[PDB]
Amino acid sequence: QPIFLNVLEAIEPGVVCAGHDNNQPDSFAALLSSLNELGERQLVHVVKWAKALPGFRNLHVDDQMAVIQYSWMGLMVFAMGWRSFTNVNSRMLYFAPDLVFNEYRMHKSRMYSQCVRMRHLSQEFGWLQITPQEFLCMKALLLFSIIPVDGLKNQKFFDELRMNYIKELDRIIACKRKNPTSCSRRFYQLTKLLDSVQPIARELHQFTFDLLIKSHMVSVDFPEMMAEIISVQVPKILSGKVKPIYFHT
Ligand SMILES: Cc1c(/N=C2\O[C@@H](C(F)(F)F)[C@@H]3[C@@H](O)CCN23)ccc(C#N)c1Cl
């Protein structure tokens, strides 16, 4: 009352810096090494955040880390889109206060197309007039949006958790949203927005995987924790063993 939203607001991560050297000419090697470091810092925070979510400990211990790892990229993308919207009106990609991507950096990073999709996702927060509370509920739903095609250790607990988060988003749209037809229109919009995160995360995963494999050749540094997740968990996604749960299609 509103207990659920109270929680989401309480656990939302603070500012996370990349540690990028902005006082020197951009280089593909430097920019990507900084995204890798930032990526690792975010994963660390995403784990603490996820573990504090209502019902999260209902999941089996093994399912817990798997769900975090599979969902990590999408969660990062979604939160980054929001920061971009709120801080710079979606004009640039606000990865961190010390790692803001303008068009030049988007190009230099060699992930221009992926950045353009992320920029579009950020613009949608404005076009759809996403509230901070809708954003928090959607980001939590995102954690429960990608699983092994052949289920988890205890799939039932996960299914119940997902259903409960869907219900929370519902209440949130209905809180001040009059008569049904409007709630339906809004749920339709948000579910479409949520689904749109998955293809972006997939493309980012593909690029990251490719870069890791050739990392030694391009002078890109991958922290050990990243190398492990990208080589062990990410291929399960790229090979189709683990897939997103789409609302539509
Ligand atoms: C999309 C994104 C990030 N992207 C990435 O992190 C690196 C990974 F290896 F960590 F995945 C890799 C890089 O090699 C190529 C894209 N990946 C990194 C940090 C944030 C943030 N905040 C966001 Cl939104």
- Angstrom distance (rounded) from CA 216 to CA 46: 28
Residue type, 221: D
- Indicate the Cα dihedral angle 143, 193, 167, 179, nearest 10°: 170
Experimental technique for the deposited model? X-ray
- Sign of the dihedral defined by the CA atoms of residues 230, 235, 241, 243, in that order: positive
Q: What's the gap in Å between 5 CA and the centre of ligand 1?
A: 28
Report whether 165 contacts 157 (CB < 8 A).
no
Residue type, 85: F
Report whether 220 contacts 29 (CB < 8 A).
yes
Pocket of ligand 1 contains residue 172 by CB under 6 Å: no
Report the chain's terminal Cα–Cα distance, integer Å.
35
Question: Which CA distances in Å does 114 have to 49, 121, 171, 199, 204?
Answer: 26, 11, 33, 10, 7
Burial of 140 (C-beta count, 10 Å sphere; 0-12/13-18/19+): buried
Pocket of ligand 1 contains residue 39 by CB under 6 Å: yes
3-state class of 219 per DSSP? Answer: coil
Alpha helix positions (H), the chain: 3-11, 28-51, 61-88, 103-108, 112-127, 132-143, 155-174, 181-218, 224-232, 234-238
| Structure-token pair, residue 9 | 């607001």
| Structure-token pair, residue 127 | 């076009």
- Sign of the dihedral defined by the CA atoms of residues 208, 78, 119, 44, in that order: negative
Question: Which CA distances in Å does 165 have to 22, 28, 62, 159, 207?
Answer: 40, 39, 21, 10, 30
Domain 1-249 class in CATH: mainly alpha
- Sign of the dihedral defined by the CA atoms of residues 124, 136, 101, 44, in that order: negative
Report whether 83 contacts 18 (CB < 8 A).
no
Q: How far is CA 213 from the centre of its chain?
A: 23
- φ, ψ dihedrals at 162, nearest 5°: -55, -45
- Angstrom distance (rounded) from CA 83 to CA 105: 18
Q: Examine residue 223 and say whether the peptide bond preceding it is cis (omega within 30 degrees of 0).
A: no
- φ, ψ dihedrals at 66, nearest 5°: -60, -50
Residue 177: half-sphere exposure toward Cβ, Cα within 13 Å: 17
Report whether 34 contacts 114 (CB < 8 A).
no
Q: Would you list the DSSP string of 85-122?
A: HHHHTTSSEEEETTEEE-HHHHHHTT-HHHHHHHHHHH
Which residues lie across from 243 on neighbouring strands?
147
Report whether 60 contacts 131 (CB < 8 A).
no
Contacts within 8 Å (CB) and 24+ apart, 214-222: 218/28, 218/29, 218/32, 219/29, 220/28, 220/29, 220/32, 220/33, 220/36, 221/33, 221/36, 221/37, 222/36
Scanning the structure block, which residue is given the tokens 């749920």?
Answer: 187
- φ, ψ dihedrals at 189, nearest 5°: -60, -50
Q: What's the gap in Å between 28 CA and the centre of ligand 1?
A: 13
Q: What's the gap in Å between 48 CA and the centre of ligand 1?
A: 18
Pocket of ligand 1 contains residue 109 by CB under 6 Å: no
Pocket of ligand 1 contains residue 152 by CB under 6 Å: no
Which residues lie across from 100 on neighbouring strands?
94
Residues 217, 220, 225: CA angle, nearest 5 degrees: 120
What is the helix (H) or strand (E) element at residue 243, kind and residue range? strand 242-244
Candidates 33, 35, 108, 215: which one to mutate for ligand 1, based on the most atoms within 8 Å of Cβ?
Answer: 35
Instruction: Identify the DSSP state of 54.
Output: T
| Structure-token pair, residue 80 | 């980054």
Residue 232: half-sphere exposure toward Cβ, Cα within 13 Å: 9
Question: Which CA distances in Å does 127 have to 87, 102, 167, 189?
Answer: 16, 21, 24, 11
Pocket of ligand 1 contains residue 38 by CB under 6 Å: yes
Nearest alpha carbon, ligand 1 atom 13 = 208
Residues 208, 209, 213: CA angle, nearest 5 degrees: 115
The structure was resolved to a resolution in Å of 2.0
Q: What's the gap in Å between 38 CA and the centre of ligand 1?
A: 7
